[PDB]
């Protein structure tokens, strides 16, 4: 049935604003480390003074610790030197293959205040998961009035929606407190 359709892409709907969720919470990091701290870092490669950024992937795997991984494995040497010299207060560890530089978490202060913001995406979202809702609600309602649906449908398939709206709600109640837990305890 047109129905099943709605369920389908109201379900859709609904795991986007998960994902747009989870991908606000991808910049909420409890540590110092972050890519942005070797903007102003420069590396004379090959006689031209190019920045950190281009001459490696960086990543951040955990709170604590920024990963630097050079795409010139030669340049290892000369980037470390470019970043204690930035003496931003970085002692860098070398894999051989990637450079790894230790950094504090956040203050427990700054900490908390994520949390916030954690929670302001938290409630963004579920506003979106209920704008599904109604918007599900209304096409079920229109569907049975063209005549595609049948009363005995429209309950079924309202109170579905309404199943799956608690399921989402309750998703991003559990990545928020995964993530205020993430962000606190570390
Ligand atoms: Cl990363
Ligand atoms: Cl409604």
Not at 113 to 130: F, I, M, S
Request: glycine content about 4%.
């Amino acid at each position: 049935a047109m129905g099943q359709q709605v369920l389908k892409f109201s379900n859709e709907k609904m795991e986007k604003a998960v994902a747009a969720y989870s991908r606000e919470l991808a910049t909420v990091r409890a540590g110092r480390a972050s890519a942005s701290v070797l903007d102003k870092v420069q590396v004379d490669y090959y006689g031209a003074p190019t920045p950190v950024v281009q001459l490696a992937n960086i990543t951040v795997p955990e709170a604590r610790l920024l990963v630097i991984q050079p795409y010139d494995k030669t340049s290892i040497g000369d980037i470390e030197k470019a970043i204690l010299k930035a003496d931003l207060g970085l002692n860098p560890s070398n894999d051989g293959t990637v450079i790894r530089i230790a950094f504090p978490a956040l203050t427990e202060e700054r900490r908390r205040d994520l949390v916030k913001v954690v929670k302001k995406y938290a409630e963004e979202a579920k506003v979106a998961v209920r704008n599904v809702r109604r918007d599900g609600n209304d096409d079920l309602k229109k569907l049975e009035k063209a005549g595609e649906i049948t009363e005995d449908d429209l309950r079924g398939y309202t109170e579905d929606i309404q199943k799956e709206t608690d399921k989402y709600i309750a998703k991003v109640d559990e990545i928020a407190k995964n993530k205020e837990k993430e962000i606190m305890e570390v």
